[PDB]
Ligand binder design. Sequence first.
Ligand SMILES: NC(=O)c1ccc[n+]([C@@H]2O[C@H](COP(=O)([O-])OP(=O)(O)OC[C@H]3O[C@@H](n4cnc5c(N)ncnc54)[C@H](OP(=O)(O)O)[C@@H]3O)[C@@H](O)[C@H]2O)c1
Ligand SMILES: NC(=O)c1ccc[n+]([C@@H]2O[C@H](COP(=O)([O-])OP(=O)(O)OC[C@H]3O[C@@H](n4cnc5c(N)ncnc54)[C@H](OP(=O)(O)O)[C@@H]3O)[C@@H](O)[C@H]2O)c1
Ligand SMILES: NC(=O)c1ccc[n+]([C@@H]2O[C@H](COP(=O)([O-])OP(=O)(O)OC[C@H]3O[C@@H](n4cnc5c(N)ncnc54)[C@H](OP(=O)(O)O)[C@@H]3O)[C@@H](O)[C@H]2O)c1
Ligand SMILES: NC(=O)c1ccc[n+]([C@@H]2O[C@H](COP(=O)([O-])OP(=O)(O)OC[C@H]3O[C@@H](n4cnc5c(N)ncnc54)[C@H](OP(=O)(O)O)[C@@H]3O)[C@@H](O)[C@H]2O)c1
Ligand SMILES: NC1=N[C@@H](c2ccc([N+](=O)[O-])cc2)N(c2ccc(Cl)c(Cl)c2)C(N)=N1
Lengths: 248, 239, 248, 248
Amino acid sequence: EAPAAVVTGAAKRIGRAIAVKLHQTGYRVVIHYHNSAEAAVSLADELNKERSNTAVVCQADLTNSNVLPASCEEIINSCFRAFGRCDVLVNNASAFYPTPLVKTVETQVAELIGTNAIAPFLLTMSFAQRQSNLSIVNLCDAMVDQPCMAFSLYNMGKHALVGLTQSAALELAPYGIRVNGVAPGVSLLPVAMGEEEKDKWRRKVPLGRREASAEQIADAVIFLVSGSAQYITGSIIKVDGGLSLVHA
Amino acid sequence: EAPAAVVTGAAKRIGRAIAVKLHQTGYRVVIHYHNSAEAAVSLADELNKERSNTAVVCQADLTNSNVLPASCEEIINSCFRAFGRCDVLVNNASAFYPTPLVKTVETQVAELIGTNAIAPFLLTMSFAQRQSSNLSIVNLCDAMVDQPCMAFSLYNMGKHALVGLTQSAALELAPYGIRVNGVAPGVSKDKWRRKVPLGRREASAEQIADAVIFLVSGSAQYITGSIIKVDGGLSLVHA
Amino acid sequence: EAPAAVVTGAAKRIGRAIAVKLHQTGYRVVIHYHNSAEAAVSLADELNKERSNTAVVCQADLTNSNVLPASCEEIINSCFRAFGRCDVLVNNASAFYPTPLVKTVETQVAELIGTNAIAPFLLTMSFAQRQSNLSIVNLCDAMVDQPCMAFSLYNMGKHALVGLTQSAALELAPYGIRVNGVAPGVSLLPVAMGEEEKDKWRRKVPLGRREASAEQIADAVIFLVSGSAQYITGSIIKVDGGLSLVHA
Amino acid sequence: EAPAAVVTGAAKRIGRAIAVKLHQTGYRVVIHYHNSAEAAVSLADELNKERSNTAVVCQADLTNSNVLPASCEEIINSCFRAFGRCDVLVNNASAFYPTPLVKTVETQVAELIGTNAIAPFLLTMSFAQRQSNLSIVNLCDAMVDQPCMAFSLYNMGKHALVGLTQSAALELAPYGIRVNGVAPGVSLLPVAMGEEEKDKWRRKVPLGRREASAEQIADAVIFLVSGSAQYITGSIIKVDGGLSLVHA
Ligand SMILES: NC(=O)c1ccc[n+]([C@@H]2O[C@H](COP(=O)([O-])OP(=O)(O)OC[C@H]3O[C@@H](n4cnc5c(N)ncnc54)[C@H](OP(=O)(O)O)[C@@H]3O)[C@@H](O)[C@H]2O)c1
Ligand SMILES: NC(=O)c1ccc[n+]([C@@H]2O[C@H](COP(=O)([O-])OP(=O)(O)OC[C@H]3O[C@@H](n4cnc5c(N)ncnc54)[C@H](OP(=O)(O)O)[C@@H]3O)[C@@H](O)[C@H]2O)c1
Ligand SMILES: NC(=O)c1ccc[n+]([C@@H]2O[C@H](COP(=O)([O-])OP(=O)(O)OC[C@H]3O[C@@H](n4cnc5c(N)ncnc54)[C@H](OP(=O)(O)O)[C@@H]3O)[C@@H](O)[C@H]2O)c1
Ligand SMILES: NC(=O)c1ccc[n+]([C@@H]2O[C@H](COP(=O)([O-])OP(=O)(O)OC[C@H]3O[C@@H](n4cnc5c(N)ncnc54)[C@H](OP(=O)(O)O)[C@@H]3O)[C@@H](O)[C@H]2O)c1
Ligand SMILES: NC1=N[C@@H](c2ccc([N+](=O)[O-])cc2)N(c2ccc(Cl)c(Cl)c2)C(N)=N1
């Protein structure tokens, strides 16, 4: 059989491009989504028209809560119920917004630490418990050590995720499960953000003065789950066009 | 008058050494304690014999809950009530235990992420909100963050998150004159002692406290976003 | 129309596996060597048997000295003379031996800092001066923050190479030249090392209790030079089986 | 009697503030200088005025060459000749100038890698070979991972100095010698810089929008050599007012 992958937050943007590229590489995919129900089903539609019975969707809120363990368990079970196996997990889903030090605070903690770190941890536990080229890829952030002003909790979540990547690589290595991260710099800039602000960011990037395409991010995920990365674990590949090297 | 410090988890071990040493330097201190009332009060007793009314205790569970925010605001308020000011926050309290990937898990999260990272973040917000002054926060980090103990995932995540906080907070609070730094102990088992380059022994708590003292001093007035390792070289030793 | 690559120290072990895998991907190769003439020629003969006129050898000492600049310029020149172009430089050649703080020391400096850091810098200058998927890959070391006892100069050269990787990424990005590193852990243990000591090192590797093959290192090099790594620069991929995550 | 320290490049700016504060703290000091003969001699005068026989000068070029080991050996020898002991080495001397990838190149290598890295290594070997609270402090660079463009060789020298810090910390620990670093951001801007340009660097510094005074860098050095730092070795304290945290 074809291997199977779970991609969290795969309805739009980078997670979609990852799901598509794994699909094109011959994976069956679980497309997880939270709110983007239309975009999820439609993507699964396109993929199933390319090969029947090779994409399903799965809805879950990945905010931290006393039911988060069961939703993460459920995401993983969805892959085994659809495909009989689960080879790859890509932790892509992520909340992003300011939490100035100077939504209630408990809800921000719940969404920014929950989605960025606790859900990846619970998903990793269930993926491991339900188990060959097994691997987990976490989408980290190339700018973790030069953070955006007023994004403390997002930054805390992404650092926690680097910690999980290292801890899990070490603890799951004996079972043959590799864990690695991909750390984008600036990739798809929200059309939400304006055009002048968009160009401000583009100008900062050494390699081409442009943001990464979603495809460029997905290419590095594909390498890490590939047979070419069989000895790579605990590694985080930056895909940032040199942005993390530029001083203030 | 004299500056004032909050130290979390101050009843015992490293938090105690920090509270004593800040007190010897002339700080008034809040000794925060969860379960250790007797030890906290005994220490406040000792400090107030040295100088009257320079040490109060403050009870709070720093588990993450819907009440954590209120608990953290109260720790900071304790200091302003007792002393009229709060110059230093030392985020020392911390839960430590394994969480194998292969207590409910959500209880482990509330303690290992709540105590180690979320309470520091909420205390930092309260400290800053409530503000020749010398304001600083010092976070107790871990020198072994990049070579973690097997099966210590959540703890390791919490300490990494604390490093992120240290950096984000240093950047955001710098305009307010508040410095934010970290101290990362190693071992502070003869297996362990023997691995340590510098003299085959664990640090004393007092050696941890010495680095804290430096970071709060006027000798460290340009330092922020820095994490001083106090590990006797342990993190440099390969497998 | 085939691109061309220089691999330094290409006659044996990891540099040989890199040259072979670049060749297999369609590159013409300069096989640089120092002392290993027979192994170098024999590799070029094999590659040229596969595809005529696709491999040449180039002899040079990469120790630091007043002639090192001209040697490095000639290595690069040899690629343009043989193939009309030079698209990839792999800085793989490296001396390694102890230098206790407690050969003259200046020869040890010349060899450990020259081969490991200064020759890379001079090659990178020549490569960029003589200039499309252009990229340089430096072979770094995953254990650079937990160094071997009494290897100060080696460790200094490898840290200097990290700095070069970062500096040259930033400065060559505007010319579209990407610069990245591959940091092995333990790979291809010396055939001469007694099996009981090899075992000590293998035992420490979480992923599989085995050293990497040379080909596993080469796989990461192939990724970085490929069209899939087009937005990656200033990155260093560790290929170490999780060894740098293991505490003492 | 009083402990003794060597400070390299101590005639002016940061190394002077370090020699002063060491002396204020009770040390006898060797003020190493290269060209700054007037300033060196003047400083030792001020110090000896305050406590007789507590300061000597020692001239040396710290460029890499086949005589660099003898000069480093002599700097340390001068301390033993003047004071009978040598407790502290501060590696502060350093060249800094552009070396664009696109003075011969071999002279740049000798000065930028020699002063920043090789001389510290050789000084370290001499210090250790010649041997209460023994310690070495290397002056590193907070910006080493976000380098100034066109400063490759300087950046390579500073990264090498970090490696030396760690390698020597590990190797010299069993002899009771601690090795640590202090990494300034921007400190004491030169008067040879435009109002415009000084304000450019100043505006970036989060903590007070101002460079460090030399005194602020010396303060950290004092701490690492003090008995309050007896368990600290292998550590590098950034003294940069937050500058390394600021993104592009
Ligand atoms: N984009 C960049 O330039 C960049 C830079 C650095 C790092 N990254 C990392 O790369 C990854 C993908 O980036 P992106 O820009 O594609 O991210 P994105 O568009 O912000 O969001 C990814 C998905 O996360 C899901 N999500 C958000 N909150 C959730 C919750 N409470 N429960 C469940 N799912 C939730 C959303 O799914 P629904 O739409 O179904 O609600 C969303 O589609 C992220 O991990 C990000 O932090 C990206
Ligand atoms: N000791 C080491 O070798 C070492 C190594 C690496 C890092 N560190 C870091 O150094 C710091 C101090 O270490 P230590 O060994 O002194 O730590 P510790 O003895 O385990 O604990 C510090 C204090 O934290 C408090 N604490 C724990 N859970 C709490 C909760 N849910 N609510 C409120 N308070 C809670 C406890 O207070 P009560 O007793 O009042 O209940 C405890 O006495 C920690 O941040 C730690 O991770 C230490
Ligand atoms: N193998 C590992 O586990 C490992 C671990 C960490 C890092 N690395 C890095 O990976 C790269 C490849 O490693 P390896 O184990 O294959 O290395 P290797 O066997 O030690 O040697 C690489 C080649 O370097 C060339 N070389 C050495 N000194 C030279 C000089 N003065 N001038 C010119 N060339 C010289 C030699 O060419 P000739 O044979 O023709 O004389 C040698 O065969 C190196 O940069 C190494 O530091 C390897
Ligand atoms: N200032 C900053 O903002 C900053 C930022 C990052 C790092 N640093 C580091 O902190 C340390 C001191 O900084 P600084 O700005 O005071 O540096 P500085 O003014 O540039 O120079 C320090 C001294 O090193 C000596 N030196 C230069 N070339 C030499 C050679 N060939 N032989 C012997 N000595 C030589 C010079 O001595 P003579 O004058 O006697 O010739 C010079 O006074 C340096 O290691 C520097 O890299 C400083
Ligand atoms: N340049 C370089 N060379 C190799 C190396 C050292 C010794 C031998 N040997 O004796 O055959 C081979 C490679 N090397 C290395 C060092 C230790 C080990 Cl265990 C291995 Cl596999 C390679 C390294 N890091 N750099």
